[PDB]
């Protein structure tokens, strides 16, 4: 439901190359990372924006 913006960042234990958003609890800013493939929870979107729309 949007309790998926309050889930930790998590960048799993797989070795790929995904660049995505998670949004940031402490400065409450959608902030890019390298999430791994696999294991990822739902703070986790595709784009800056998507990101914004959910979370902001
Ligand atoms: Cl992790
Ligand atoms: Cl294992
Ligand atoms: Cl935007």
């Given at each position: 439901?949007?309790?998926?913006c309050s889930?930790?960042?998590?960048?799993?234990?797989?070795?790929?190359?995904?660049?995505?958003?998670?949004f940031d609890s402490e400065t409450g800013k959608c902030t890019?990372?390298?999430?791994?493939?696999?294991?990822?929870?739902?703070?986790?979107?595709?784009?800056?924006?998507?990101c914004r729309?959910?979370c902001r």
């Amino acid at each position: 439901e949007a309790s998926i913006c309050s889930e930790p960042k998590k960048v799993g234990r797989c070795k790929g190359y995904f660049p995505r958003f998670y949004f940031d609890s402490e400065t409450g800013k959608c902030t890019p990372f390298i999430y791994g493939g696999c294991g990822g929870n739902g703070n986790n979107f595709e784009t800056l924006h998507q990101c914004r729309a959910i979370c902001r």
